[PDB]
């Protein structure tokens, strides 16, 4: 968990073709937009 106290917040989702694209790879792994 990472503290979200300041102005820094800048997360909200909206891309061109992809939207809420979840990756699972044999090596790496993640969640985008």
């Amino acid at each position: 968990k990472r503290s979200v106290l300041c102005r820094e917040s800048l997360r909200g989702q909206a891309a061109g073709r992809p939207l809420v694209a979840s990756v699972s790879l044999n090596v790496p792994a993640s969640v985008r937009y």
């Binding site: 917040s9 800048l10 909200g12 989702q13 909206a14 992809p18 979840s22 699972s24 790879l25 090596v27």
Partner: protein
């Protein structure tokens, strides 16, 4: 030097290729199976499928498959969304053949053994757990399940109660019905199209019509609320956006950006972001907020996301709304639409300035349209949006069935009737 080269077969699968200059080639078979393809009885099987990509298959044992790619320093990524499931495969120019024969096994010859699939099961929880660490994921997820009723309201992550109950026949059936010729698009970033085709022809010819999962769209206004103990509260407010690759849609996208607050500057505040300004003025010191914009084949979701504190939740939430009301009251001057536009254009270009980006963009388009639209053309389309059009689309949010999802201490979070 050579531009891409699409080719629809008799099966209906799409294939592209770009012999690039640089050392790195990356295949990616995108099969049309998203999370929207499962029913009440099938929910969480894409999730498990996503996580079972290294299991034994007909030609290659789990051991060979993983040690094989290691051998050569490759990576095998299995990405999925509510509508699609990209199976990525990176590796060195000289090793694509060793690697491709892996992608093919993994995708057309899966052998889900009771024992193997059983070991996995627990991985689902671990995976779910790590992804649910970001409030974004559970809220975003909850959003889809409240705004939809049937298909797109299915989440990406296995439902807690299903975990151990995802059976082998289930995986085998999902592959069979969805991992088929008509829904597939090969995509190479450093491979020969002539030699790609050959292979595509030899290995990707399987029959399976759409909707054996139960395809169909539908939007339904609803609110899912998750109470917590966390200081901060997140909430989404969203109404039916326009559909994928349509004019209305595009419009939305442009409007999105007029308010859209994804910081372009480290430690920097937006001066451009209306939402941010408006919110900011009526809001406290610490907060953050952004325009949300989703588009899928058979419906969309447009609206904003908020991150306030316990007692500001409302203030923020309304503030945001009000401002987006302003644009729908007609109040929006030309200067801001053109900036927006150029913001968007810039964005799309950067989005495709990478191999991984490009390869996604291409595949993506393959599944929707059936060909590759060049960037330029893309760029033209976005420009065509009218300054009014934007307003008009915005009118629609304010006058469109609401659907919201929040988390945290919800004493001060407006309900539907509150706004």
């Amino acid at each position: 030097p050579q531009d891409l080269e699409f080719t629809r077969l008799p099966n209906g699968l799409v294939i592209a290729s770009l012999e690039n200059y640089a050392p790195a080639s990356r295949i990616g078979l995108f099969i049309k199976a998203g999370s929207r393809y499962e029913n009440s009885n099938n929910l969480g099987t894409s999730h498990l499928l996503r996580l079972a990509s290294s299991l034994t298959t007909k030609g290659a044992s789990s051991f060979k498959i993983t040690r094989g790619i290691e051998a050569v320093g490759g990576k095998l990524s299995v990405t999925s969304t509510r509508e699609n499931m990209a199976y990525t495969v990176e590796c060195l120019r000289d090793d694509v053949d060793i690697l491709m024969e892996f992608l093919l096994n993994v995708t057309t010859a899966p052998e889900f053994r009771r024992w193997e699939v059983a070991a996995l099961q627990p991985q689902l929880r671990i995976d779910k757990a790590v992804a649910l660490q970001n409030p974004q994921a559970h809220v975003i997820e909850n959003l889809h399940a409240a705004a939809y009723r049937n298909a797109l309201a299915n989440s990406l992550y296995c439902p807690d109660y299903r975990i151990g109950k995802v059976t082998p026949v289930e995986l085998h059936d999902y592959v069979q019905n969805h991992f088929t010729s008509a829904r597939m698009a090969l995509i190479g970033l450093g491979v020969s199209h002539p030699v790609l085709k050959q292979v595509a022809e030899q290995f990707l010819n399987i029959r399976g019509g759409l909707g054996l999962s139960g395809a169909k769209a539908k939007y339904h206004g609803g609110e899912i609320r998750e109470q917590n103990g966390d200081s901060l509260v997140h909430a989404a407010l969203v109404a039916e956006s326009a559909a994928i690759g349509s004019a209305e849609a595009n419009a939305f996208s442009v409007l999105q950006h007029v308010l859209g607050a994804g910081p372009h500057v480290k430690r920097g505040s937006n001066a451009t972001s209306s939402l941010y300004q408006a919110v900011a003025k009526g809001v406290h010191q610490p907060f953050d907020v952004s325009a949300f914009n989703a588009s899928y084949s058979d419906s969309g979701l447009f609206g904003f996301y908020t991150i306030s504190q316990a007692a500001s939740a409302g203030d923020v939430i309304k503030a945001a709304y009000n401002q987006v009301k302003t644009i729908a009251q007609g109040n929006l001057s030309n200067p801001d639409v053109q900036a927006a536009k150029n913001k968007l254009k810039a964005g799309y270009l950067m989005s495709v300035e990478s191999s991984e980006g490009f390869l996604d963009e291409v595949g993506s388009q393959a599944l929707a349209a059936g060909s590759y639209t060049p960037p330029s053309t893309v760029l033209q389309q976005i420009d065509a949006v009218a300054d009014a059009d934007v307003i008009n689309a915005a009118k629609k949010f304010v006058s469109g069935r609401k659907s919201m999802a929040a988390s945290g201490n919800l004493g001060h979070t407006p309900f539907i009737d509150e706004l």
